[model samples]
Target: GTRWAVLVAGSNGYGNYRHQADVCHAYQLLIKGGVKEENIVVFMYDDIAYNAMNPRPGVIINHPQGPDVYAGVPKDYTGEDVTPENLYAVILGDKSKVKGGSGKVINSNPEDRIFIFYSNHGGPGVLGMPNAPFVYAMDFIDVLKKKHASGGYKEMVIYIEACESGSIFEGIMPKDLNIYVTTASNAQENSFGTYCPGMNPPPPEEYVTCLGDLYSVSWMEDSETHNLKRETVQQQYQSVRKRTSNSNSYRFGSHVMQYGDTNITAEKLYLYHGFDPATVNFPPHLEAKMEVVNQRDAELLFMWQMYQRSNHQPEKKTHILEQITETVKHRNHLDGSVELIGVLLYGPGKSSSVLHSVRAPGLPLVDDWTCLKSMVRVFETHCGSLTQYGMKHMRAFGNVCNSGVSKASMEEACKAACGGYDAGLLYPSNTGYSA
Candidate 1:
């Protein structure tokens, strides 16, 4: 029942800080997923020279006719605004307003789900800042705990895309609350760059990235692609970290560790909600029944299961379908009739038209793994009931078989096959039949 919020801080213009784009991309995805606009607060400060207090520019709507078009247009185009109200804000010259302006209101809502995403230059117990002596590690935790206590937050998920960020969650035990903290490097380690550490620091390099920074971009990519929900991000992070550590060697040794209850489970992450199960676009009916057969093997079962997973009630089914489709495409050694059908229809290389004659509006076609599993359970229950009925009829018919074969013989065969102890007569295999 509580509301959800995203708080993002990215410093692009200062102290070797990079990764602002990656952070922004993450927020954008969350917003697109379902988070409310007003609930998201972004503080992107261009700390290049870190002497000014200008917030980053916000989104602006422009018309094709030009500035004069505003006279006749229902809405006028205004330049980007970095005020606290706007969902996206940027500070061009100052870093003070960030930890100052709206930072105080972050936890104002007592019943909110807080997601704190920060990407910047980091060292032990501090994130880079021009004026502040040190962005104390405890300070971040204190502010979070204060908001949690005052605002009555149910959970907090933090993603730190900076060096020495691992200490944020190290050794700290959390309760029902979930914490996800990843660091670019360990406490004793300094983040690597093109140049030697503690020597001449390498100048900033230009790179295109989604999210606020490079590390954040990598993290989000892994999360979204792998469908890393509340529970599995840690595992997914480990895989990515291993790969990066091996490739980058020195400056880019990515490390991820978890500090929370591992017993907890999140439905969205474990289930293949993002995969596409190629389903026939059946028309809506008051009630519906669909039968898919010749499944052959797990590949088909997976596809059919994914299709059933696509019908999540009270949620957008399209997103689920899209995500699952992506996962399925990336998965390895997929084989089977149904599986191939789904893959051909919804896999990464395929087109949406395979499932629809024309693009359907609202949400894209995706699996609702949760709903699909429920449907399968129900279907199996029904099948069990019908199977029982069949056994009863077969037993009744066997009673008439006494004219030829022995009752004991049929009973043994039935019992051996079913373990049900079915007792009845068996007819001779050569019994004559007339039309």
Candidate 2:
């Protein structure tokens, strides 16, 4: 059977170097495992390789000074083209719906096998992207539903490396579909980034950002060592699961998870990533331990690194300090506004519940994705967009929806909490500025 691939790095900028690097590394694995370049569709912001901050220009790696994974990666979508809408079009093989960049779609046959890999920063029920504001879990599931109805492929597998990645499929995807899913973490945790500064085997001195995410590194490193023909999907899952959660080695690690159609785990890995006939000499993973950082705080970590390094450069140091101050102010505004909205909607007694609540272990994050998405728009319309740092509040927004608050009531809370705010300001700069 023909094998197809869709690889995505969900964020951009040099500070998010690891996100695009994971996508590039995933592409390399598919190619080395015998998947053809033409059958693979790649989407990345494509800014990391040549960013001024990159120590090695025109190169990207998923390991400390590892081989370049950037070579020959297809730029199917980049920059503004990396929107969630384009991702759906690519998955459904809706070529005409594509916006720009490479016009290729999955276009798989009914007998084909499919593999999807997405890595980057993510919150409870929302994923970060370069251009688009967010990709909600419900909308993502609906696209899979469309793909299933179309029957464009025989079987599909998905591997997601992100914070709360399990929420995308947890109790939401059905077992009937011939799809198997694995996530970097469960429904309410942060995935870790590794090989950053201060690691046992640290990146080169010039490097200020992380090289790879812990979960993505575990799975890809495992896949790189094992020949696809000799390994079953379940075997690889177990191996990755063990290595990923090795908190004793890593400063911290994530709890790897799987969902949907456990029966598919019995299949050979070659179905999704074709086996290379010459592949041999399977090796075990390395003994090296690495440093870890929370995915949500990766950008902040980079800034802190810069701040530490700019000691002698007085101007640069103060610039970084100003950015830190501004960021703190922004975060506080987001937190306070949301908190105020909670008090307004649910009152003080129930406000805490509305602000932070998790779903039942086996249940989806929310019952109505449409309502959740609408509330996001409502909040953004008045308070402002939930930046990468603020995306964590998405779960809270879903809780707000689950409580069955009326649209008029949501609008009222938003207006009251963020009133008299100037439009088009993405961040809160004035510390004294209050609604």
Candidate 3:
């Protein structure tokens, strides 16, 4: 019944690439969100990168030596080739080996979920490929698509944290499966490798420094700020890409594209519901006679209005959810009566779990603690903001919280609101706890 996630960093030969940091930070966020230690997995290749995974104290791998430098970070991973198979070996629930390698933790259960995340300097191919030496995004996509279709996993969410990841999206799509992808840049765009924005002139050589991949920074910042789900993260990415890069100078713009069927609502995905659709409730007297228009159109209009009110500016967007609460209050006063308690829109099918962060075919590149924190960030963003109003409204409804939207159904709405319903794990806890 529990979910699972994976993080994979292909930059095995480099040290200090934010690719490793981003990958690791992602794990940190997940752990904070409450992902169990056993459900999360991180794989790093470079010696410095390996440390990011926090492998058990005794575990050891061959770490390479020398200036071992790449973009100034000391190149250190002398360990054995880190392939997808090795990555999966470590988190698959079998602790056959305790030193230097990964093992299974979730048993590849069909009902248990999996999330995949990748942060690396991707060019045209995958890492560790034959003469090419790197795996092509498509190559990994193909393998994953097949695995999801045949593998026992209940669901799979993939996050391609590299440039041109968009190009890989066109390669795969499977039913009864969930997939989400975030490319450092569009297929044609060149990714800005690593540089710390917090630093000036950058740290001098020989000094330890954190790698700065813009998208990763944007991801960490947004995840920390808005508790944004992958889709909302994509929406926020639009703003981040513009702010982080010299938009005019960069030929290829940065963007995040998601693909999946995990059915999530905006509240759960963005961690802050800009406005409660429940607040639009028509009065009891009007409900029976209220004209029902195209349900889909009504829902879209409702969401658009909420989206229009959400502020995305650097200094203000984090507070957008707060504003939504005010908006809901104002609407309630204007009506002087409760609106339709039940959702007006119908569904094509029951909602599925949302995909949070995803990697490629193997286990996640993050740790359990990081995953939990990310969720905590999400909970704080929404529950912290809407709880007062949401709880009050629910109390007014009496048992309506169980009938109207309910925490379980709203979880799907959260991801759906942000367009990441297919991602995975949108609503993972109790509704009251999530709100």
Candidate 4:
């Protein structure tokens, strides 16, 4: 059976170097494993390398002192071409429906094995894109279902690396679908970052902070050194989970998960990595270091690093303080707005309690997509895109749905929170939200 892979990095900018880096590294792994370059479709913003802010132009690395992963990577969907609609269309093999880039579409038949890997910022029920339009869980599910019904492939595997990534398939994907899914984090947690200063390579003089995601790096690095032909997907998952847990002991780390057809776990890693099993040999496993605990704190950490490195103490201090203040201000605004909306839906006392409960570790996600989509749109109208910092509080909104808050109450709460802002006008337009 022919093997096909789709790799995506959903964010842009140097601050998000790890995402594109991860995607490129995945591409390299597939190439090394013998996947044909033409068979691997990549979707990335492709901005990190050669960016003006990037000190090492045209070079992207996934680990400390690692080789550049950017060279020879395909620019299938770069910049505005990377969108949820294009991603879905690609998966569905609808080349006519694709809008930009190389218009590369998945052409897998029933005899083919397919693999998809995504790394990006994510919120509850959605994965962020560099562009405005986000990939909603329900929409993704629909695409997968359509692909299945179309006899597109024999089996599919997906690995998602993002915060709250479990929400993508939780209660949404069919268990019987010939797909095996794994996520960097469960629905209620944040995936961590690694390879920052003090973790592996020392702080660079050029101001780079993080190089790779904790979970993605763990699995990919292990694959680089291990015999892919002998390593089962299950083994890789277990190793990654353990290493991630160990790394997160000092800080927050996501709980990696496997969902849908568990039997697929027995498949060898070579199926996805494209390596011939017989030619590879098992090797020593690499130890991982957990660095930044929260991805949202990456910007803050970068600012701090700049402050420490700058000789212009007064200007740097002032800039740093301003950024910190804005971060806290946004955090407070999200907290207050969501709490108010929750109170409006479920009353003051219960709303407070529900918010607290939702934040608890391992809190099972509410699977009411109809309620969730409506409530999320309402929240976005009043509060702004959850893809921003407000994503952290999405569980509180989920709580509102789980409580069976009336739609009328949700509408009223949105109206109240939005105040003079035209809630209707704030709705996402055809072009979607701008950066």
Q: Which ranking of candidates, highest lDDT first?
A: 2, 4, 3, 1
Name the candidate that leads on lDDT: 2
Clashing pairs in 2: none
lDDT of 1 by residue, 302-359 (tens): 3334356457642656654665564444232111222332333245354223422321
Candidate 4 stretches with Cα past 4 Å from truth are: 200-207, 247-252, 276-279, 284-289, 310-324, 356-367, 418-435
| Alpha carbon RMSD to native, model 1 | 28.7
Tens-place lDDT digits, model 4, residues 1-435: 898898988887777888899999999888888899888889998888888768888899887778988999989999998898899988999998999889788988899988999997887767878867677787888899999999999989899998889888887778777899989988767887887755543546564568888888888887887888777889989898877766546255777888878898998888878774444555624364554548777756766676666656886678767767766665666677787886777688777887646444333455576676777776665565554455566667667888888877887887796666432323455435422
Q: How far is candidate 4 from the true structure (C-alpha RMSD, Å)?
A: 3.5
Per-model TM-score, in order, reads 0.42, 0.94, 0.46, 0.88
What is the per-residue lDDT of model 2 for residues 43-147, given as tens digits with 9 covering 90 to 100?
A: 998999889878889999889858999999988888878888899999999889998978889998889988999998788778877754577877888888889
What are the lDDT scores of the predictions, listed in order? 0.34, 0.83, 0.40, 0.77
Question: Which ten residues in a row are the worst by lDDT in model 4?
Answer: 422-431
Judge candidate 4 at residue 38 and give its lDDT: 84
Deviation in Å, model 4, residue 110 alpha carbon = 0.5
Error of 3 at 389 (Å): 54
